[PDB]
Amino acid sequence: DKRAKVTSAMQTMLFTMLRKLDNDALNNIINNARDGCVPLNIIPLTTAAKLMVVIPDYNTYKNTCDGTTFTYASALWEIQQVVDADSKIVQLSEISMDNSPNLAWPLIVTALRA
Amino acid sequence: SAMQTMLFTMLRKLDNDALNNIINNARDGCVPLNIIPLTTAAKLMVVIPDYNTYKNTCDGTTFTYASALWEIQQVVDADSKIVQLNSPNLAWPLIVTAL
Amino acid sequence: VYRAFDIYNDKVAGFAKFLKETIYNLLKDCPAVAKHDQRLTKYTMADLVYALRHFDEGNCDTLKEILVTYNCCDDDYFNKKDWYDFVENPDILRVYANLGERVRQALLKTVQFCDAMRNAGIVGVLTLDNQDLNGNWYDFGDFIQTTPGSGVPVVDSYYSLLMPILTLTRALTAESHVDTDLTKPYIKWDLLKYDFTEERLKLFDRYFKYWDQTYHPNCVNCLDDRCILHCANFNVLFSTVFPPTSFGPLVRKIFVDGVPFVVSTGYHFRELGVVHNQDVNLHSSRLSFKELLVYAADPAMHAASGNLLLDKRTTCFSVAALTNNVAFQTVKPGNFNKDFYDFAVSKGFFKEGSSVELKHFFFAQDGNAAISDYDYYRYNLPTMCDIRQLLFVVEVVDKYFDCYDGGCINANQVIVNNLDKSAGFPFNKWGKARLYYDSMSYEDQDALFAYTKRNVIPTITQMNLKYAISAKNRARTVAGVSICSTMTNRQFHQKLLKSIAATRGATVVIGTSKFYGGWHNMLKTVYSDVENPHLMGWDYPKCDRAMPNMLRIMASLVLARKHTTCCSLSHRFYRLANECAQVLSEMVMCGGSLYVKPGGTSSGDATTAYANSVFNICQAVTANVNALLSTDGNKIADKYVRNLQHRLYECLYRNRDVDTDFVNEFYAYLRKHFSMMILSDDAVVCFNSTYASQGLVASIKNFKSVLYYQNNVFMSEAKCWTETDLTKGPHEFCSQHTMLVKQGDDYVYLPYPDPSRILGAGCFVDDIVKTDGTLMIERFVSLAIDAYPLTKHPNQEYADVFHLYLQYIRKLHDELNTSRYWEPEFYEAMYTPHTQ
Amino acid sequence: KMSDVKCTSVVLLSVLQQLRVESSSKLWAQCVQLHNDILLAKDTTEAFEKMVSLLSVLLSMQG
Ligand SMILES: [Zn+2]
Ligand SMILES: [Zn+2]
């Protein structure tokens, strides 16, 4: 019975995806509201330990990811990695006005919460 | 496979000068390294072997390719230094990039 | 010289353009009252509402003047062509928004003015005409004094007519700032706050205190579908001042044998308010199949284990990025069949100057296509509709659907077709819908349906790119919704949908084949005894992108009126709420991440075509209503339609309960003078041209104005067609043309397609055919069946397409009676009305 | 004389995709841009002029 296979897959997915769930910000953000009921659109914004920005062109990068640290979601993020849209590592020194046409946009900027 | 033989068969049939002149020039080894600009006169790196009938390529510092005329401003060969034109003491690739 | 008035006497009624005591001694203390004798402006609020409700270019001089005078924009702005569109140059929205505060301040004056009257004991009716664009009031003509402190005002027509332009000019924007001021920072709302019910009621009492009917901030407390539409219409306006992060599913931590999950136990709809589930267990153990299916489908687990995402490519609200890497999907160019092209050129096709060419191609898209196409939801805006008008139209439309039967059905008696469809995320990881339909048992399906009858289950739909032919450059995405939605929607709607698709002769022609005389019978049904008839058809720009939320809920509420004996109002309400969360504003899995849909229609939803049919009928009825109500009553000579217009206005803005006899009368009037044939979004009408030439039925400019003020799009004359000579069939219906031919000793109508499309689909294939020689010949028989009518066309080149195709089937049969498909007669009998 | 141009452009882009040009981003972007640009060509000279560019993209590689 393939029903066993599919339910096993569902259980495995749920259990494996619970590991990365509890960050101890969840419990201090749920008990901070009556009824323990919060919108789902705030759990990643105040609980996730990682940030991803998809930068389409340079003019957005110069306004968002200034330096190695930027401010977003009323928090400070430090740039951990920049990767072009070919899964190729990119150094922050290459991203300049003159070199920008050589870059393969968009760029995925992975940042950490600190 | 089975697509190149279905591609060049038609390619010969369109009978376009701007196409056959590119294929035979690239047949013996004189291929480009980038795309040819339709507008804005962008650079195009064309590599030519050691005197691959250079007379059929340039005439009086004027490049002919794809039935189009290009004005040469800079030439760099495999020695990374601009060479002027005896013949045997050269390298194989000659980039005659023009704008 | 002309001015807009809202007139209601016992002789003439309507909102239309026309020519041209001691009461003031008891209202001068009010600050909203203009000083009589003075200091009044040129245009009134009626002129604004008229210009923004009945809009066409060339004659929109007043709207242009209004904007320039109130400093919204300069004189130079109207020189750029195509400013008024909402798709091209969306910046016009900003211009409209500069009217917003002037439309809010006015409202305040109204709440003040009525407060004077109830203090002075005055009974009367307030109309948009007596108010100045600055907000003041005047023209104390129809007021009558009574005992002081008992004065009562009438604001039904005023508020109802003004409702559509309250969201167009975003008037309540100043309610988002602190102290309600335009020069102060935004209100720093709490991030864990989602109720806003008291704020909703504060907004109601601040702006619509004297609105007589009761408003339910949470539509779960509502009484019937009409009350649901009312309070949801008000919630649409009030939800645009609250933080966008406060909507979507509400989550709570449960424990299952110790381990805590974060699950959805509610939902905050911008239209339906706050809804809370009813079967909630904070402690569980050994989850069965149903709970697994629900818990892996809601966005609760995915948005919590995923990373925060900021996507600067779109402007749509983004939630989370489900994968470390961002996915870019490309669609490949279509494979090309050399044999058919060689055969066609060997027979003289594709020569210079020919009428038939190649214009349909498998266009190729780069990796930036899916998100670029998904960013087209910026055309879906929060639109508030006139409540009285829409409440009459939802009663007129149900007459068009009172011929079918509905009812919620059991799991065993469900017919499934082509079970191999994307089961949505994350159900497409382990197979298609077929696996799930063979795993779950019947009682599991029934229990899941009952669960959705008492709880809200938000789901995630996946957006992919389609591999299809077209003559346009666009991307043509595909939305695949979760099977936890399809199962329940099928169980809810299949019996009604099969009834709509099985009756012939109705206005909705969904599910009727054009073979065996179907086209001819459908056309003759469209004609059906209309005097002086012309034909006309229109187009819906960005139909599935800009379709409002009120219209989609109204379409769901109309399609749900068949459930009067199988489920109660709360059960019908929870079904409606499940639908809105599941297919209207759920979370989309684009790339490797999740976004939110501001609305629109899911192309992959099995209840789509019928919902667009309801929306098309609603727009038609609205067009006739606004055409009949914008006509000068005096200039109408007929004594029947003038009384019809009188009772129409009286039933919209003066009568509360539905007047059934007028519903039947007006439905019969439309049927007699304006006949329709409706398929999902393509529509044809046969209309009495003499009436339409004097404003008794809907022209095409009425459709233009209705779409402008109610659908937030612009419809142009290029795709709208009219026909004054009826012997030629309709110009365009469902990518088919119609021609009148002589066969079988009489005349018939046959449909024929564009031969360019047929040739393009013959040259280029989906690559799912090149390996096998049977699917190829089947496809060629399909296009030969579609192309057979071209033999009867006057043009010889058009006629030769069929001969080319038939010889091609003949060759493919050689290379490898009514059953044989290579002789022509097999295709002739396809179009004779004798028989499948 | 214009149908066969738009007809061989299709197999050109097909073989370019088969050569894993799609793996790169800035190459596939311009390839599809000019291919879709000439699928709307209404003058044959432009179609040939951009057919030159696509054939060059084929010939710039040694595979
Ligand atoms: Zn209510
Ligand atoms: Zn029911």
Author numbering:
A (entry chain B): 78 to 191
B (entry chain D): 85 to 169, 176 to 189
C (entry chain A): 31 to 50, 84 to 100, 117 to 895, 911 to 929, 932
D (entry chain C): 2 to 64
Give the authors' words.
SARS-CoV-2 is a positive-strand RNA virus. Its replication is mediated by a multisubunit replication-and-transcription complex of viral nonstructural proteins (nsps). The core component of this complex is the catalytic subunit (nsp12) of an RNA-dependent RNA polymerase (RdRp). By itself, nsp12 has little activity and its functions require accessory factors, including nsp7 and nsp8 (14, 15), that increase RdRp template binding and processivity.
For the apo nsp12-nsp7-nsp8 complex, we vitrified the sample in the presence of the detergent DDM. The structure of the apo RdRp complex contains one nsp12, one nsp7, and two nsp8 proteins, with an overall arrangement resembling those seen in SARS-CoV and the recently solved structure of SARS-CoV-2 (15, 23). Our structure, which differs from the SARS-CoV RdRp structure but is similar to the recent SARS-CoV-2 RdRp structure, reveals that nsp12 also contains an N-terminal β hairpin (residues 31 to 50) and an extended nidovirus RdRp-associated nucleotidyl-transferase domain (NiRAN; residues 115 to 250) with seven helices and three β strands. After the NiRAN domain is an interface domain (residues 251 to 365), composed of three helices and five β strands, that is connected to the RdRp domain (residues 366 to 920). The nsp12 RdRp domain displays the canonical cupped right-handed configuration, with the finger subdomain (residues 397 to 581 and 621 to 679) forming a closed circle with the thumb subdomain (residues 819 to 920). The closed conformation is stabilized by the binding of nsp7 and nsp8, with one nsp8 molecule sitting atop the finger subdomain and interacting with the interface domain. The closed conformation of nsp12 is further stabilized by the nsp7-nsp8 heterodimer, which is packed against the thumb-finger interface. In addition, we were able to assign two zinc ions in the conserved metal binding motifs composed of H295-C301-C306-C310 and C487-H642-C645-C646, which are also observed in the SARS-CoV RdRp structure. These zinc ions likely function as conserved structural components in maintaining the integrity of the RdRp architecture. Outside of these changes, the apo nsp12 and the RNA complex nsp12 are very similar, with a root mean square deviation of 0.52 Å for all Cα atoms across the whole protein.
